[PDB]
């Protein structure tokens, strides 16, 4: 009396940022967002539901997780169980394929993979749209990792209408790369910013414009246009935290050094553009045909261990056990 499933999902990096929840219970976002799914970083997850299990168990990278590290997995297991009318405890075993001791966020790839594995194990037979809706309830950004390449999370207005979809780009994403500069809370800083920042309305008033321009850059394969929009959108998101009460920044000293070096690279004719999420690492969007020039430039202040490249990656892969 057991049911099991497995999935692999890749990480994605938001170009137009997800930033603020309109509804916390269902993770419906204040604004739509757009990401690129990456080949380099991913999660592999298996889940087992078994009548003989006596409690929910989460093992990550071979290590038993404690109640605090298991809280998000357990809330996702509870809602997929309630939706199946399933009364069994589960065991989740996951491995994050990311750089060791690097601060990469694996909630996108982790929750997407778990959603896919549960979909298989419980035989939910979800379409890609409904699987994205399910993954959305685990982690907002996970709903975009259902898809490969460019993907947009439409904010919708309800559980039924908030979900992601691939953005056809006539394979332009296979000409692009992202270089991660590894530099020595997301959900709480976001909530504080939505509820208290004098700058948050300025964030909202500019997202739709940014999304339209990204769509137009994609349709014309205009890399400098794309890069300018996404770099400014990321800086706008980080500006909002300085208007929160109390104010805060996600940046570290090394973040600013990296951002400054990207601007210098661009001054020397290397078209590249940075973005940051809720932490200090700096991701650099660059065309493949320019990636080695960019790595050559940043060698002077960063070891090779700090420069990890990534390319466009596929949507979720589901596996029967």
Ligand X SMILES: Nc1ncnc2c1ncn2[C@@H]1O[C@H](COP(=O)(O)OP(=O)(O)OP(=O)(O)O)[C@@H](O)[C@H]1O
- Candidates 185, 196, 220, 296: give the one binding ligand X (CB under 6 A): 185
User: In terms of Cα–Cα distance, which of 201, 138, 161, 187 is closest to 21?
Assistant: 187
Q: How far is the CB of 104 from ligand X (least distance, A)?
A: 7
Question: Do the annotations mark residue 139 as ligand-binding?
Answer: no
Which residue among 32, 96, 145, 162 contacts ligand X (CB under 6 A)?
A: 96
Site string for ligand X, 38-57 (x = CB under 6 A): -----x-x------------
Binding to ligand X in span 277-296, by CB under 6 A: 278
Number of Cβ within a 10 Å radius of residue 222: 15
Please pick, from the candidates 3, 14, 40, 73, the single residue that binds ligand X as defined by CB under 6 A. 73
Which of residues 7, 14, 38, 114 is near ligand X by CB under 6 A? 114
Spell out, one character per residue from 141 to 170, where the chain touches ligand X: x when CB under 6 A holds, - when not: ------------------------------
Phi and psi at residue 16, to the nearest 5°: -105, 120
Q: Where are the beta strands (DSSP E) in the chain?
A: 2-16, 21-23, 28-29, 33-50, 57-60, 63-64, 90-97, 150-154, 163-166, 176-181, 272-275, 282-287, 307-310, 317-319
Q: Distance between CA atoms of 264 and 176, rounded to whole angstroms?
A: 20
Distance CA 78, CA 125 (A): 19
d(CA 318, CA 298) in angstroms, rounded, equals: 38
> What are the strands, taking DSSP E only, across 77-155?
90-97, 150-154
CB of 20 to ligand X, least distance (A): 14
Which residue, among 284, 222, 238, has the nearest Cα to 38 in the 3D structure? 284
- The 3-state DSSP class for residue 94 equals strand
Smallest distance from the beta carbon of 79 to ligand X, in angstroms?
14
Of 91 and 295, the one with the shorter C-beta distance to ligand X is: 91
Question: Has 244 been labeled as part of a binding site?
Answer: no
Instruction: State the nearest-atom distance from the C-beta of 114 to ligand X, in Å.
Output: 5
> Least CB distance from residue 111 to ligand X, whole Å?
6
Give the sign of the dihedral formed by CA 15, CA 19, CA 23, CA 25.
positive
The window from 28-36, 46-54, 108-116, 205-213 that contacts ligand X (CB under 6 A) reads 108-116
Binding site for ligand X (CB under 6 A): 43, 45, 60, 69, 72-73, 94, 96, 105-107, 110-111, 114, 185-187, 278
């Amino acid at each position: 009396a057991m049911l099991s499933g497995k999935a692999r999902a890749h990480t994605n990096i938001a170009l137009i940022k997800y930033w603020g929840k309109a509804n916390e219970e269902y993770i419906l976002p204040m604004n739509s967002s757009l990401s690129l799914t990456l080949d380099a970083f991913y999660t592999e997850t298996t889940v087992t539901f078994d009548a003989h299990y006596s409690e929910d168990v989460f093992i990550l990278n071979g290590i038993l997780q404690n109640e605090k590290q298991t809280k998000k997995v357990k809330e996702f297991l509870n809602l997929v169980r309630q939706q199946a009318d399933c009364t069994w405890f589960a065991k989740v075993e996951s491995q994050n394929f990311v750089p060791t001791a690097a601060g990469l966020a694996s909630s996108a790839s982790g929750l997407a993979a778990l959603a896919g594995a549960c979909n298989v194990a419980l035989g939910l037979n979800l379409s890609a749209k409904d699987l994205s809706r399910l993954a959305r309830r685990g982690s907002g950004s996970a709903c975009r990792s259902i898809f490969g390449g460019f993907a947009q999370w439409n904010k919708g207005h309800s559980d039924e209408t908030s979900f992601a979809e691939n953005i056809p780009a006539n394979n332009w994403e296979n000409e692009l790369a992202m270089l991660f500069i590894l530099i020595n809370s997301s959900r709480d800083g976001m909530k504080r910013t939505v509820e208290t920042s004098s700058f948050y309305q300025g964030w909202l008033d500019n997202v739709e414009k940014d999304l339209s321009q990204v769509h137009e850059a994609i349709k014309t394969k205009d890399f400098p246009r794309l890069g300018e929009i996404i770099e400014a959108n990321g800086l706008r998101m980080h500006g909002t935290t300085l208007g929160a009460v109390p104010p805060f920044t996600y940046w570290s000293p090394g973040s600013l050094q990296a951002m400054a070096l990207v601007r210098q690279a661009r001054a020397k004719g290397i078209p590249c553009y940075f973005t940051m999420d809720a932490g200090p690492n700096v991701k650099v969007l660059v065309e493949k045909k320019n990636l080695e020039a960019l790595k050559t430039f940043l060698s002077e202040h960063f070891s090779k261990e700090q420069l990890v490249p990534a390319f466009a990656g596929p949507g979720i892969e589901l596996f029967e056990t």
